[PDB]
Ligand binder design. Sequence first.
Ligand SMILES: [Mg+2]
Ligand SMILES: [Mg+2]
Ligand SMILES: [Mg+2]
Ligand SMILES: [Mg+2]
Ligand SMILES: [Mg+2]
Ligand SMILES: [Mg+2]
Ligand SMILES: [Mg+2]
Ligand SMILES: [Mg+2]
Ligand SMILES: [Mg+2]
Ligand SMILES: [Mg+2]
Ligand SMILES: [Mg+2]
Ligand SMILES: [Mg+2]
Ligand SMILES: [Mg+2]
Ligand SMILES: [Mg+2]
Ligand SMILES: [Mg+2]
Ligand SMILES: [Mg+2]
Ligand SMILES: [Mg+2]
Ligand SMILES: [Mg+2]
Ligand SMILES: [Mg+2]
Ligand SMILES: [Mg+2]
Ligand SMILES: [Mg+2]
Ligand SMILES: [Mg+2]
Ligand SMILES: [Mg+2]
Ligand SMILES: [Mg+2]
Ligand SMILES: [Mg+2]
Ligand SMILES: [Mg+2]
Ligand SMILES: [Mg+2]
Ligand SMILES: [Mg+2]
Ligand SMILES: [Mg+2]
Ligand SMILES: [Mg+2]
Ligand SMILES: [Mg+2]
Ligand SMILES: [Mg+2]
Ligand SMILES: [Mg+2]
Ligand SMILES: [Mg+2]
Ligand SMILES: [Mg+2]
Ligand SMILES: [Mg+2]
Ligand SMILES: [Mg+2]
Ligand SMILES: [Mg+2]
Ligand SMILES: [Mg+2]
Ligand SMILES: [Mg+2]
Ligand SMILES: [Mg+2]
Ligand SMILES: [Mg+2]
Ligand SMILES: [Mg+2]
Ligand SMILES: [Mg+2]
Ligand SMILES: [Mg+2]
Ligand SMILES: [Mg+2]
Ligand SMILES: [Mg+2]
Ligand SMILES: [Mg+2]
Ligand SMILES: [Mg+2]
Ligand SMILES: [Mg+2]
Ligand SMILES: [Mg+2]
Ligand SMILES: [Mg+2]
Ligand SMILES: [Mg+2]
Ligand SMILES: [Mg+2]
Ligand SMILES: [Mg+2]
Lengths: 87, 81, 205
Amino acid sequence: ANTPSAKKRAKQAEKRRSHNASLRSMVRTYIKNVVKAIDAKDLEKAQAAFTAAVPVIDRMADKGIIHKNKAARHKSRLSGHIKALST
Amino acid sequence: MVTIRLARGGSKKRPFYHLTVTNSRNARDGRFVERIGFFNPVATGGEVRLSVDQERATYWLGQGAQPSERVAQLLKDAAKA
Amino acid sequence: ARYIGPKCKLSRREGTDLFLKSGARALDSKCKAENVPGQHGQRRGRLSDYGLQLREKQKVRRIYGVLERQFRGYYQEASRRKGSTGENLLQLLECRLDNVVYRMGFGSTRSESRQLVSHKAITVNGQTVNIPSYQVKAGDVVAVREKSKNQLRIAQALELCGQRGRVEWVEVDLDKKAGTFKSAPARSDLSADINENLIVELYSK
RNA sequence: GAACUGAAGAGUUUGAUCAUGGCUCAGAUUGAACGCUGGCGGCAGGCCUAACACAUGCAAGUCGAGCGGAUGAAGGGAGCUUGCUCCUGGAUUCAGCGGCGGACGGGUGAGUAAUGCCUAGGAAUCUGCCUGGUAGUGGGGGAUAACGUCCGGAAACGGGCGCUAAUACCGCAUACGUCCUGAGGGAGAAAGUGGGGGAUCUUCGGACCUCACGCUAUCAGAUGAGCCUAGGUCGGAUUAGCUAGUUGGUGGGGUAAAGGCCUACCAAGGCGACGAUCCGUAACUGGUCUGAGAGGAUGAUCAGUCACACUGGAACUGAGACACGGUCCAGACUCCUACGGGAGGCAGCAGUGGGGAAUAUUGGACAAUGGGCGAAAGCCUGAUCCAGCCAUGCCGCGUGUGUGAAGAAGGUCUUCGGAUUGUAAAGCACUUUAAGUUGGGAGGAAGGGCAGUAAGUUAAUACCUUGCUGUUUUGACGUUACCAACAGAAUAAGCACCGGCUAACUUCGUGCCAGCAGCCGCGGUAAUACGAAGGGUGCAAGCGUUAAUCGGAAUUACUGGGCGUAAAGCGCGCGUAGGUGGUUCAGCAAGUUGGAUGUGAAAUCCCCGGGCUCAACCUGGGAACUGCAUCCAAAACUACUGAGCUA
Ligand SMILES: [Mg+2]
Ligand SMILES: [Mg+2]
Ligand SMILES: [Mg+2]
Ligand SMILES: [Mg+2]
Ligand SMILES: [Mg+2]
Ligand SMILES: [Mg+2]
Ligand SMILES: [Mg+2]
Ligand SMILES: [Mg+2]
Ligand SMILES: [Mg+2]
Ligand SMILES: [Mg+2]
Ligand SMILES: [Mg+2]
Ligand SMILES: [Mg+2]
Ligand SMILES: [Mg+2]
Ligand SMILES: [Mg+2]
Ligand SMILES: [Mg+2]
Ligand SMILES: [Mg+2]
Ligand SMILES: [Mg+2]
Ligand SMILES: [Mg+2]
Ligand SMILES: [Mg+2]
Ligand SMILES: [Mg+2]
Ligand SMILES: [Mg+2]
Ligand SMILES: [Mg+2]
Ligand SMILES: [Mg+2]
Ligand SMILES: [Mg+2]
Ligand SMILES: [Mg+2]
Ligand SMILES: [Mg+2]
Ligand SMILES: [Mg+2]
Ligand SMILES: [Mg+2]
Ligand SMILES: [Mg+2]
Ligand SMILES: [Mg+2]
Ligand SMILES: [Mg+2]
Ligand SMILES: [Mg+2]
Ligand SMILES: [Mg+2]
Ligand SMILES: [Mg+2]
Ligand SMILES: [Mg+2]
Ligand SMILES: [Mg+2]
Ligand SMILES: [Mg+2]
Ligand SMILES: [Mg+2]
Ligand SMILES: [Mg+2]
Ligand SMILES: [Mg+2]
Ligand SMILES: [Mg+2]
Ligand SMILES: [Mg+2]
Ligand SMILES: [Mg+2]
Ligand SMILES: [Mg+2]
Ligand SMILES: [Mg+2]
Ligand SMILES: [Mg+2]
Ligand SMILES: [Mg+2]
Ligand SMILES: [Mg+2]
Ligand SMILES: [Mg+2]
Ligand SMILES: [Mg+2]
Ligand SMILES: [Mg+2]
Ligand SMILES: [Mg+2]
Ligand SMILES: [Mg+2]
Ligand SMILES: [Mg+2]
Ligand SMILES: [Mg+2]
């Protein structure tokens, strides 16, 4: 780079990336656990995973890592799958 | 934001200004949405110094458009009359 | 620009009135003004239609001392103006400032009137105008400078023009060296010999 | 009320004529170039070719009212003395963390024949800064840069250990608004800084009340962007077949959002002579030039949209990027090196090499209008405002004026008398435009600061917000525009042509030679056509020449042509798509007609005004933009529907 503000923006960008990656991994981990819980054909563990996953999903949606429509879509679809499994 | 400022028409050393309601991220005389009047810094003879349209300006202010400093001065001076 | 050269060789070539001198003695007994110039001068030289258009266009240009870019601009403006462009051209070309300060009686020749108007010696409403092309609106009081009212050239030009006719549409007060124009001249006022239609035929080709 | 009102032909095939038919000419225009020549001003314009490679210089920073740290003045006082240090304080400056901006403004037209542009629409979306409402801004923690210390390096710097700050980061406290969950319940955030103060606990440290900025959740408004549908958008059929994620469905995934956008199965579909696929070429539009119009050519300036940023890819940061002076990987080419490794991207403004017929200064300032940052001073701005070179274009003004017959001298021709250059020259007499010199001299300038005064929110004459008053305060252009005076006609004309078309003739020299030429054509011993002289004609600070478009060309003929003999009827039938359709009654309302409504960006074109001494140029109002879409009414003709009739 040439202007020092470009350098500062760059380094703040790698810091922001190294931050955001961990939290994106965390949310993906929680939804993945939930999804493999439903796909394993068990209800109680699916209930527990959903209850333990919604708070982090919504906290992250508010935190600005992901967009809120995405979180709402995830919640609705997973709840629909579990309710379908309930029968 | 969307702001009201001055677009420089006229000729060299003979200015003329259109009071333009443009998005602030546009050129001096680029695209706009409406024009409220003009200001002539040479006057002389039957030429009028300034004129604006009051109702459209009130509408634009009621929609929250920031006027520039010179535009603010000229619009308050016109409102005096 | 302007034309510099003999002012009666032109008259000899054209063979017509072509006012270009003070008119002190006469128009004839200076240059035997009936033959075209040069060695080949006695021949009448019957000339075609294009000759007619060229000859009268040169006639009008030389009598009014206008160049051809300016003249064609004048013609375009006349064509733009409504109502029989042929006489519109004459009416608009008459309102030139130098020809007015001539016809108002302030100058001996068109060239001398241009001499006076260019050197900033004439007013319109007191404001210095020195463009020998200014189109004088009706009503303006064309006058010479209060400083310049004592020059004898204006006096001699005025006494010479005292006997040249009356146009019967201007109102001129002679004591104070001032003019006044009320309304534009009519077609019948100007010399009804040269036709205007042949010019517009020339420029319509 | 005005918005237009407009159309020319000539030459050349023949011994001569009429027709057909091609060629050439007279006009208007260029981002133009070349040859001869050259005084000035105003307004504009200026690498069309190599998106070829590039030396140096400049073109994006800002905030101490976010945060530690270090620079710490002036001082209230002390020591010894006149200098320093120190207690308490403290005005300035900034390396780093942090917040905004860098996605705007600026450049270019390579790619792109359709994921682009233009016209009309519509449904499933997002959106910082701006405005209007609503509800809040409570309590904790773990780090880290800078800073020390050590190692390593040529440098950029990298690494180990220690400690610190926040409006940096993450839990915790609740949910008027929100999210999902069917009701049921559940889920999800905040940051504090600056100015004052009545009372209260108390170090009015602080708590508490107010204001200013700022922060959080949400509804709405604009502003900007994303997505879909129908119609239009160059040439070629000597390009006729193209497509297997291809066409549709179901389940899931994914995006902010609909969707084969992605995936697994289900069936074999989809597009195309109304031109699919392929090849060549090219950013599109408003518009520009021509034309009487219809059309034809075109996309220089200015404005809207799109695409790109040495070449090829990919993602991160954010509200927004696949990012024009950001990151990473690979490549080509130039450069440094301690040989370990590094650096670069002028299609940003001047500049250079090269290419070319050909396109300019390595100039000023934030003075003004905008932009970024901050609350305010203020900084940054090759955007912008001005200068430089250039007859490149348009417009305007100068090189003077009157008299002047002895019709002066030279030149040219002659019929030797004379004519012609020619009032032209000389002579006599006048003004100072422009340029030169000197002296006056507006307008682009809004605002900024200091003090006072009056109104308003609290609970308060406290702060601040708002009006006004008074003092002070700036220009690169710039020796401004403009004004006045002074001497002096002083000081500043060239180019083409003269056989016809086309305005303008004689002589001398060669003798089908030398030469001219847009088309007919001139020249071989009186050339108005060659080369020169005189004399004229045409334009004029320009004049010609070349290249390019339309016109004339009714010469691609819709307006508006033709086919017996000039070019032009298939050798002849049958017939597919397509085009066309005898007559009556009735219906419908697609064509057709009238009207209303929305749009057709601004500028440019046209009409009437205003300003610069006029014009060029600038600018107000109107007209216009034949187009497109949505509705209402009519039924003569065409189409569609039903029932007939016989030519
Ligand atoms: Mg929480
Ligand atoms: Mg949030
Ligand atoms: Mg001129
Ligand atoms: Mg013959
Ligand atoms: Mg014939
Ligand atoms: Mg700093
Ligand atoms: Mg741009
Ligand atoms: Mg270019
Ligand atoms: Mg192609
Ligand atoms: Mg924070
Ligand atoms: Mg389409
Ligand atoms: Mg498949
Ligand atoms: Mg489906
Ligand atoms: Mg599917
Ligand atoms: Mg699609
Ligand atoms: Mg095709
Ligand atoms: Mg093109
Ligand atoms: Mg191309
Ligand atoms: Mg094109
Ligand atoms: Mg392109
Ligand atoms: Mg026209
Ligand atoms: Mg025509
Ligand atoms: Mg260009
Ligand atoms: Mg544009
Ligand atoms: Mg891009
Ligand atoms: Mg790229
Ligand atoms: Mg390159
Ligand atoms: Mg690259
Ligand atoms: Mg993001
Ligand atoms: Mg960038
Ligand atoms: Mg660059
Ligand atoms: Mg450049
Ligand atoms: Mg060069
Ligand atoms: Mg060269
Ligand atoms: Mg400013
Ligand atoms: Mg700088
Ligand atoms: Mg010039
Ligand atoms: Mg030249
Ligand atoms: Mg002739
Ligand atoms: Mg010749
Ligand atoms: Mg001879
Ligand atoms: Mg000759
Ligand atoms: Mg034609
Ligand atoms: Mg032609
Ligand atoms: Mg024919
Ligand atoms: Mg034959
Ligand atoms: Mg036959
Ligand atoms: Mg056939
Ligand atoms: Mg048949
Ligand atoms: Mg048929
Ligand atoms: Mg019928
Ligand atoms: Mg039919
Ligand atoms: Mg209609
Ligand atoms: Mg328009
Ligand atoms: Mg009806």
